[PDB]
Design a protein around this ligand. Sequence first.
Ligand SMILES: Nc1ncnc2c1ncn2[C@@H]1O[C@H](COP(=O)(O)OP(=O)(O)OP(=O)(O)O)[C@@H](O)[C@H]1O
Ligand SMILES: [Mn+2]
Length: 184
Amino acid sequence: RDAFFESILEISASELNINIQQKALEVITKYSDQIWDAEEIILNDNKAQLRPYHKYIAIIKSDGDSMGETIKSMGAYNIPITQLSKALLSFNIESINEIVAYGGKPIFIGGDDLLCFAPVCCNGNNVFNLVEKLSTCFDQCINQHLQQYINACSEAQRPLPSLSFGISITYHKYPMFEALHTTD
RNA sequence: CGCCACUUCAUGGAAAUAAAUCACUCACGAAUAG
Ligand SMILES: Nc1ncnc2c1ncn2[C@@H]1O[C@H](COP(=O)(O)OP(=O)(O)OP(=O)(O)O)[C@@H](O)[C@H]1O
Ligand SMILES: [Mn+2]
């Protein structure tokens, strides 16, 4: 209710325009194992257009780099932290928008982290394309809101705040606990 | 006009030179874990 997508395979092959949730529910009609198996064999006999990247799952984890250091650097130049809050919130909203646009799934947070469950390739768009768009969105929000900090601390020299990225691509099997720890 | 032969029996040069020296495809696939 306060929110408004499961298994591991449905968002690995969200490109065929095929609704595995509906057919899996029809077949099954405790829960997770049976529907997991149903989705598995449904896209097993969807072999006609199934490429090897349709069975691989990409986990994307990102965190903000030196946020406290950026805060301390803005403190020297008399720059409010409200601008940083603005940039982070706008980046998070745009991140959710473009992650659902790409074909993946946002899971974790709209803070300075992001854990996304995305297919390797949907509509000819990579997970690396998704990472590039996320980085560009974060840079755009930083520049748009911290413009004062941008043209005040970057002329002489400084690295601007950025986000480091962690991507893990594994089979739909090979459970996602180990994959999550590998991503971490 | 008559008569009649002896000689000489491979040397020098080139003796391999360039091109290609691996190429493409497959570099794990399923099952068992979740
Ligand atoms: N809306 C916001 N505005 C400003 N700062 C924020 C906001 N939300 C979170 N933060 C900051 O995020 C920080 C948490 O960042 P985190 O600890 O993940 O990374 P870091 O220590 O900056 O980076 P790294 O590990 O790369 O050195 C907190 O110190 C907090 O001040
Ligand atoms: Mn963080």
